[PDB]
Amino acid sequence: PTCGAHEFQCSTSSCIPISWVCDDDADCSDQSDESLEQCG
Amino acid sequence: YEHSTVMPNVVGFPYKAHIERPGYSPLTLQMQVVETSLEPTLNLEYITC
Amino acid sequence: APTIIDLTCTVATCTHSSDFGGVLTLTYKTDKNGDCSVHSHSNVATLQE
Ligand SMILES: [Ca+2]
């Protein structure tokens, strides 16, 4: 299930907007958005 | 936040007061009278032996 | 944009003070995650965000 071009996929396969990535908010249930590897 | 209450003068009675601010969650206080003492005022009259 | 259906509004606390003294909660049903432009249609209450 590939998310849209403006959406990010958490490791639980959930889709969140790209603008929510590394925003210091735990949008993904598993904190995949705030993961250190993705944020660099 | 000013408040007022009335509590009994019984030693060891666990009085509980409820404070309900409209903007905050309610709070409960516990006040207990451990010990009292009544002090009169004395005037010495004389001494007998 | 997300499709919002069955949106209800409830207020937790209100206090007409100079600062933002009102907490508002919305219940809704949606299909996707996104961003909505929230506005109030009267000048009796001013939103913060
Ligand atoms: Ca995030």
What six digits make up the tokens of C15? 């206090």
Q: Return the number of other C-beta atoms located less than 10 Å from residue B23's C-beta.
A: 13
What six digits make up the tokens of C25? 């909660």
**Rounded to an integer, what distance in angstroms lies between the CA atom of residue C29 and that of residue C17?**
32
What six digits make up the tokens of A8? 């990010």
What residues have CB less than 8 Å from B24, skipping those under 6 apart? none
CA of B16 from ligand 1 middle (Å) equals 44
Residue of A nearest to C31 (CA): A15
> Which amino acid, residue B17?
A
Task: Using CA atoms of C32, C37, C38, C39 in order, give the dihedral in degrees to the nearest 10.
Answer: -150
Phi, psi for residue A18 in degrees, rounded to 5: -65, -35
> Which amino acid, residue B11?
V
For residue C20, CA distances in Å to A16, B5, B7, B35 come to: 30, 31, 37, 46
> Which amino acid, residue A3?
C
What six digits make up the tokens of A35? 């993961």
B with A: 3 or more CB pairs under 8 Å?
no
CA of A40 from ligand 1 middle (Å) equals 14
Rg (CA), chain B: 20
* Site from C11, C13, C18, C20 to mutate, B interface, most B CB atoms within 10 angstroms: C13
User: Chain A residues with CB-CB distance to C under 8 A?
Assistant: 15-17, 19, 27
Are residues A9 and A33 in contact, defined by beta-carbon separation less than 8 angstroms? no
Q: Return the number of other C-beta atoms located less than 10 Å from residue A10's C-beta.
A: 19
**Rounded to an integer, what distance in angstroms lies between the CA atom of residue B42 and that of residue A3?**
90
**Rounded to an integer, what distance in angstroms lies between the CA atom of residue A37 and that of residue C32?**
26
Q: What is the DSSP string of A1-40?
A: -PPPTTEEE-TTS-EEEGGGTTSSS--STT--TT-HHHH-
CA of A21 from ligand 1 middle (Å) equals 4
> Which amino acid, residue B40?
P
**Rounded to an integer, what distance in angstroms lies between the CA atom of residue B17 and that of residue B35?**
20
